[PDB]
Amino acid sequence: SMLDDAKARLRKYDIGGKYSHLPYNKYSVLLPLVAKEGKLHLLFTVRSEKLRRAPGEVCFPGGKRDPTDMDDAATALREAQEEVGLRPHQVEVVCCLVPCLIDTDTLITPFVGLIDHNFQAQPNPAEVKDVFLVPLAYFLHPQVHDQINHIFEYTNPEDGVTYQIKGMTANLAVLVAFIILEKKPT
Ligand SMILES: COc1cccc(CC(=O)Nc2cccc(Cl)c2)c1
């Protein structure tokens, strides 16, 4: 099946807890995969304009580890619940992808999660201005704009709204698309 095939592919790239104890400032993100209309999608957030760090930017759910978290995956799930109402029974964490080093002292660990079909986002407006889906296949043939760094522009066909996706968030989306969609019979 589509979902069993995606999980099998993802597991081959799992690094597990290999880098998890290193003494960094630690953040986790959840890369949430949603199946709709017979295709996989990634779920993104738009950060609230009142946040001091990166207002109005497209981001995956996530945040800083705190002492309650049993592990890095728990960070991702706790933050996703706070931001978009995703409950733990609604997500299966499949793997941990290569972590992202930034600022010399920070390590961001991405987890891919399969999201239940009955989940409906409840954006928490103190943190999230918007939530939207992009088909995973978009990231194989994105609409690129050069600002010099590459920015993706995705237009939702439901409503015509265009979102800019860039940086680590864009990078991770392409990685997941490659992992799941490369070398597939039609
Ligand atoms: C983009 O690079 C990142 C670096 C460190 C963490 C994160 C995840 C995050 O913080 N997401 C998030 C989304 C919506 C609202 C709020 Cl409060 C947080 C992303």
From Swiss-Prot:
Which intervals hold domain Nudix hydrolase? 24-149
Q: Where does Mg(2+) bind?
A: 79, 83
* Site, as annotated: Important for coenzyme A binding: 53
Work out whether the entry's keyword set contains Magnesium. Answer: yes
Tissue specificity note:
Expressed in liver, kidney, pancreas, pituitary, small intestine, spleen, heart and placenta. Weakly expressed in brain.
Q: Under which main EC class is this enzyme filed?
A: hydrolase
Primary residence: other
- Indicate which residues form the motif Nudix box: 64-85
- Record's superkingdom? Eukaryota
Gene Ontology molecular functions: coenzyme A diphosphatase activity; magnesium ion binding; manganese ion binding; snoRNA binding
Record-listed N6-succinyllysine modification sites: 7
Which Gene Ontology biological process is one annotated for this entry? butyryl-CoA catabolic process
What is the E.C. number? 3.6.1.-, 3.6.1.77
| Sorted UniProt keywords | Hydrolase, Magnesium, Manganese, Metal-binding, Peroxisome, RNA-binding
Entry GO terms, CC: cytosol; peroxisomal matrix; peroxisome
Question: Where in the cell?
Answer: Peroxisome
Provide the activity regulation entry from the record: Inhibited by fluoride.
What are its cofactors? Answer: Mn(2+); Mg(2+)
Q: Which reaction does it catalyse?
A: hexanoyl-CoA + H2O = hexanoyl-4'-phosphopantetheine + adenosine 3',5'-bisphosphate + 2 H(+); octanoyl-CoA + H2O = S-octanoyl-4'-phosphopantetheine + adenosine 3',5'-bisphosphate + 2 H(+); butanoyl-CoA + H2O = S-butanoyl-4'-phosphopantetheine + adenosine 3',5'-bisphosphate + 2 H(+); decanoyl-CoA + H2O = decanoyl-4'-phosphopantetheine + adenosine 3',5'-bisphosphate + 2 H(+)
This protein's assembly is summarised as: Monomer.
Functional note: Fatty acyl-coenzyme A (CoA) diphosphatase that hydrolyzes fatty acyl-CoA to yield acyl-4'-phosphopantetheine and adenosine 3',5'-bisphosphate. Cleaves CoA, CoA esters and oxidized CoA with similar efficiencies. Preferentially hydrolyzes medium-chain acyl-CoAs and bile acid-CoAs. Has no activity toward NDP-sugars, CDP-alcohols, (deoxy)nucleoside 5'-triphosphates, nucleoside 5'-di or monophosphates, diadenosine polyphosphates, NAD, NADH, NADP, NADPH or thymidine-5'-monophospho-p-nitrophenyl ester.
Family as reported in the entry's similarity comment:
Belongs to the Nudix hydrolase family. PCD1 subfamily.
Protein name (Swiss-Prot/TrEMBL)? Peroxisomal coenzyme A diphosphatase NUDT7
The species this protein was found in: Homo sapiens
Its lineage opens with: Eukaryota, Metazoa, Chordata, Craniata, Vertebrata
Covered range within the whole protein? Answer: 14 to 209 of 238
